[PDB]
Amino acid sequence: SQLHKVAQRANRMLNVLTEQVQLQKEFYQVYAKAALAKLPLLTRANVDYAVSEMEEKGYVFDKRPAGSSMKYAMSIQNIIDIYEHRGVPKYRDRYSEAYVIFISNLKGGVSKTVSTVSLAHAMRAHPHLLMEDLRILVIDLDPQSSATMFLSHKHSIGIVNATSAQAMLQNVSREELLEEFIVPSVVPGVDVMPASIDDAFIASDWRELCNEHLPGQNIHAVLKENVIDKLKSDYDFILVDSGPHLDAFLKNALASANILFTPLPPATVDFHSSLKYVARLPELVKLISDEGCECQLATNIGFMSKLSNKADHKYCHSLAKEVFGGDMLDVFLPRLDGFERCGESFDTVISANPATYVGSADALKNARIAAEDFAKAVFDRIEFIRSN
Amino acid sequence: SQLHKVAQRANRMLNVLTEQVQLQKDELHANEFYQVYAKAALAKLPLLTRANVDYAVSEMEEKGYVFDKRPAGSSMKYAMSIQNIIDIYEHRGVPKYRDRYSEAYVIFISNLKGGVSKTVSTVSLAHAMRAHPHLLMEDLRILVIDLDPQSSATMFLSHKHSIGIVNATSAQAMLQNVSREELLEEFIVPSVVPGVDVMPASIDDAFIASDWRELCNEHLPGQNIHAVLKENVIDKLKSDYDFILVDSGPHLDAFLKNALASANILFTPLPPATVDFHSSLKYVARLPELVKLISDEGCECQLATNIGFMSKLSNKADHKYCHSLAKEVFGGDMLDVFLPRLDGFERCGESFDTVISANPATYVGSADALKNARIAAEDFAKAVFDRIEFIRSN
Numbered sequence: 001s002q003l004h005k006v007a008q009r010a011n012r013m014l015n016v017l018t019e020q021v022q023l024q025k026e027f028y029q030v031y032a033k034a035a036l037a038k039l040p041l042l043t044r045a046n047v048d049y050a051v052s053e054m055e056e057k058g059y060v061f062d063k064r065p066a067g068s069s070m071k072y073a074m075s076i077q078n079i080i081d082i083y084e085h086r087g088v089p090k091y092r093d094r095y096s097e098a099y100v101i102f103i104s105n106l107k108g109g110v111s112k113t114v115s116t117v118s119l120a121h122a123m124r125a126h127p128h129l130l131m132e133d134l135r136i137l138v139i140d141l142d143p144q145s146s147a148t149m150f151l152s153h154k155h156s157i158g159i160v161n162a163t164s165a166q167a168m169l170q171n172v173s174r175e176e177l178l179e180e181f182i183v184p185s186v187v188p189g190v191d192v193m194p195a196s197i198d199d200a201f202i203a204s205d206w207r208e209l210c211n212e213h214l215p216g217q218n219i220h221a222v223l224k225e226n227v228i229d230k231l232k233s234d235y236d237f238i239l240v241d242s243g244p245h246l247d248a249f250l251k252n253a254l255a256s257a258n259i260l261f262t263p264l265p266p267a268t269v270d271f272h273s274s275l276k277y278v279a280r281l282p283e284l285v286k287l288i289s290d291e292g293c294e295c296q297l298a299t300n301i302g303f304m305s306k307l308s309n310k311a312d313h314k315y316c317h318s319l320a321k322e323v324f325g326g327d328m329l330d331v332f333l334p335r336l337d338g339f340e341r342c343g344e345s346f347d348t349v350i351s352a353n354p355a356t357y358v359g360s361a362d363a364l365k366n367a368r369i370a371a372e373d374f375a376k377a378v379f380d381r382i383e384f385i386r387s388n
Numbered sequence: 389s390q391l392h393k394v395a396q397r398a399n400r401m402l403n404v405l406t407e408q409v410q411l412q413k414d415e416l417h418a419n420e421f422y423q424v425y426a427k428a429a430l431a432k433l434p435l436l437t438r439a440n441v442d443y444a445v446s447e448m449e450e451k452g453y454v455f456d457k458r459p460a461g462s463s464m465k466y467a468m469s470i471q472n473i474i475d476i477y478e479h480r481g482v483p484k485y486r487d488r489y490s491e492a493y494v495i496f497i498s499n500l501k502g503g504v505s506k507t508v509s510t511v512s513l514a515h516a517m518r519a520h521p522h523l524l525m526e527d528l529r530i531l532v533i534d535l536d537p538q539s540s541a542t543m544f545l546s547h548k549h550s551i552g553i554v555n556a557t558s559a560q561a562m563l564q565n566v567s568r569e570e571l572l573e574e575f576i577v578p579s580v581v582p583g584v585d586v587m588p589a590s591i592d593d594a595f596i597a598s599d600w601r602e603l604c605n606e607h608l609p610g611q612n613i614h615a616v617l618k619e620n621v622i623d624k625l626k627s628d629y630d631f632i633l634v635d636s637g638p639h640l641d642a643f644l645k646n647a648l649a650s651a652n653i654l655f656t657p658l659p660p661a662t663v664d665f666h667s668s669l670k671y672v673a674r675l676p677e678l679v680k681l682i683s684d685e686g687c688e689c690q691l692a693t694n695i696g697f698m699s700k701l702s703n704k705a706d707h708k709y710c711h712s713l714a715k716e717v718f719g720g721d722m723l724d725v726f727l728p729r730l731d732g733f734e735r736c737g738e739s740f741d742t743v744i745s746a747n748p749a750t751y752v753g754s755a756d757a758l759k760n761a762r763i764a765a766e767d768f769a770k771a772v773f774d775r776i777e778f779i780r781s782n
């Protein structure tokens with residue numbers, strides 16, 4: 001019974017490791033005052049007018065020493081406050097309930113996680129969307145916790161116990177969710193409900209686990225009802241990311257989504273595997289419905305992901321347009337060195353500090369712009385869907 | 389309901405692309421594996437000498453055996469393939485592995501924490517043992533059973549256009565319960581290295597894992613749901629392979645339980661980062677419980693032991709520390725060799741090549757890098773082979 005023998009030493013080392021991590025436990029972006037004029041609706045004159053009026057009222061802007069005289073170091077919140085002061089409404093002023101996005105595809109490694117966390121940070125901080133003052137939550141439902149690691153700071157969560165899966169089973173109050181399950185990401189305004197390796201055991205025993213702690217509740221509606229419905233007034237966008245496993249987490253994510261996006265890989269074979277997922281989607285929803293709840297799933301938008309300037313890639317892109325037609329996004333996510341490098345250190349191209357970036361400055365810049373163009377394209381497609 | 393319309397079109401496009409893929413398929417040739425040895429280098433191998441190699445070659449040629457030769461400047465020179473070397477050992481009367489072990493030994497490199505190298509380790513172990521310079525006299529027959537719908541093992545083992553669109557998968561074989569002969573002819577496919585075969589996987593298997601219980605009750609009425617891989621596949625191929633390695637995704641589902649119930653031994657790749665190592669130890673502590681659950685609902689696992697090894701290890705300060713903790717946890721069951729993080733592995737990984745199969749004439753990296761990683765795979769495979777020999781012979 002040596003498995004027990006090694007298992008017991010393992011159990012003891014865990015407590016030793018947990019102590020080592022708990023004994024170890026920021027956005028870089030600021031704007032010069034003059035730089036705000038480049039933003040929509042702002043001018044050098046109206047920014048100075050709003051700034052002086054706010055300071056007269058008592059507001060204090062962030063500043064940082066610039067050699068001799070000290071200068072304004074506008075944070076994203078400072079900019080958002082300036083738009084508010086000037087009477088520009090926020091996104092929540094026209095939509096009164098969180099919209100749920102699920103970037104999904106049974107084929108793994110196609111960028112579900114990177115496009116998810118990039119979309120969240122880039123919508124928040126997009127130059128043209130700051131006036132929208134977006135509140136965004138990313139719910140991680142993959143036990144591998146890739147979204148969690150991208151959104152938090154290494155020595156911030158350390159060992160996570162309160163996970164999205166735990167919240168689903170415990171069925172707590174809006175207040176407890178906000179206070180004990182949700183954690184802020186590196187970019188203020190974007191939050192994450194983390195995941196951990198222990199959730200793999202939760203997924204495995206979902207049936208029985210639901211009978212015990214959630215007697216009578218439909219097994220596919222647990223995330224929507226015990227978590228998302230309680231946070232509907234606290235966020236403008238809620239993005240769910242799960243692993244590629246066709247299990248309870250994936251089904252609960254599907255049942256809670258308002259819209260789906262499918263990242264489409266460009267290599268003929270990966271594209272082929274992705275189409276099988278696209279072809280069986282209606283089958284999965286039917287299955288969910290027939291045995292419980294209905295998905296208020298609007299449409300499924302496709303976008304090429306990790307696209308390169310290669311004959312075969314352009315060819316599959318041609319085929320994707322044919323398959324998705326109108327539901328094809330006009331913007332794609334290019335394969336770029338910036339995404340690759342940031343991916344290595346679990347940074348989003350929006351959160352990576354350019355001063356620390358171990359790579360070409362241009363590569364980081366180009367990737368940020370790609371993420372911004374993709375986020376703007378997604379935001380506008382969603383605006384069209386919700387405005388009609 | 390445009391969801392149905394997009395699906396319809398996706399389906400039509402699928403059929404189109406299937407045909408286009410099938411037409412591009414290129415049949416694989418066993419005599420194409422790149423590795424060849426100079427006749428003179430054979431004397432460096434175990435049990436061979438300059439004189440007994442010269443005698444063996446001459447005696448074999450006299451019986452009609454023909455060794456390939458290639459122009460090398462001023463003369464044509466022998467280009468010895470691994471099969472030619474295996475045949476020289478046989479000519480000399482050296483027994484093979486199957487002459488002392490008559491049933492396949494099942495290995496499962498497992499860990500619920502993902503990206504720890506379960507796949508690259510499995511695939512590198514399979515190719516590197518078969519083609520290890522010091523294990524050629526064993527003439528090994530190795531099968532890799534891919535049970536991950538993402539099919540990473542399948543991709544590493546085959547050539548892009550050698551396999552085509554996959555339908556006959558490991559998961560399908562488990563449900564169809566076909567004969568030994570049908571498995572050998574319709575499901576098993578050869579990898580780029582002769583002697584190492586693969587039972588492939590495909591994205592469709594994700595639906596099979598999800599509906600497992602209903603599918604078993606329907607296609608396999610009355611059979612224990614944890615005993616399917618062992619009884620419908622592996623037990624039938626026991627005389628056909630020396631080692632059978634199983635690779636599944638990092639999901640606690642039927643494929644992983646079926647692999648556990650089938651293995652003779654387990655290896656746990658242990659990642660070097662504190663938190664990853666931490667997630668791995670949670671898996672190691674829960675193993676007994678996993679095995680116990682399977683025992684309670686059906687079959688008993690015959691898992692000998694669980695050997696741990698450091699994977700993607702770097703000569704770093706923090707890594708050295710976790711390596712110490714791993715020793716304390718696994719103790720005598722820690723392998724002495726580790727798989728280091730190396731650019732060769734990373735580059736080969738991007739093109740789904742094994743560092744054993746990668747042709748140095750095509751490698752888009754430094755020659756030293758590929759060579760270093762090939763040697764690291766060979767050292768790891770020999771250590772694993774030696775450890776299993778000790779267990780099986782004592």
Ligand SMILES: Nc1ncnc2c1ncn2[C@@H]1O[C@H](COP(=O)(O)OP(=O)(O)O)[C@@H](O)[C@H]1O
Nearest residue numbers: 108109110111112113114334335336339340343
């Ligand atoms: N556009 C891109 N360009 C370059 N690398 C990318 C891009 N999108 C994702 N990646 C990288 O590809 C891998 C797979 O992406 P990931 O988001 O984890 O996929 P899923 O979430 O599909 O498994 C990661 O290692 C990631 O850093």
Ligand SMILES: Nc1ncnc2c1ncn2[C@@H]1O[C@H](COP(=O)(O)OP(=O)(O)O)[C@@H](O)[C@H]1O
Nearest residue numbers: 148149150152153154345346661662663664706
């Ligand atoms: N924000 C995060 N939260 C949790 N885990 C993380 C985070 N960022 C990275 N990780 C995990 O920790 C590891 C850190 O890599 P490592 O090379 O040890 O880092 P450093 O060199 O930062 O110690 C990764 O392989 C990953 O599994």
Ligand SMILES: Nc1ncnc2c1ncn2[C@@H]1O[C@H](COP(=O)(O)OP(=O)(O)O)[C@@H](O)[C@H]1O
Nearest residue numbers: 502503504505506507508728729730733734737
């Ligand atoms: N020793 C290594 N050095 C460098 N890269 C490695 C090494 N082992 C694995 N990798 C790379 O790490 C990734 C994860 O390995 P993989 O075998 O797929 O893990 P699992 O099978 O753990 O999901 C792949 O991109 C792979 O090529």
Ligand SMILES: Nc1ncnc2c1ncn2[C@@H]1O[C@H](COP(=O)(O)OP(=O)(O)O)[C@@H](O)[C@H]1O
Nearest residue numbers: 267268269270312542543544546547548551740
């Ligand atoms: N042996 C294989 N069998 C099936 N799919 C493979 C195999 N080797 C690689 N692949 C898949 O095909 C892709 C090949 O990359 P890609 O950039 O399209 O290649 P090329 O540029 O070779 O067309 C990988 O991302 C992987 O998903």
Ligand SMILES: [Mg+2]
Nearest residue numbers: 112113146242
């Ligand atoms: Mg992911």
Ligand SMILES: [Mg+2]
Nearest residue numbers: 506507536540
């Ligand atoms: Mg794998």
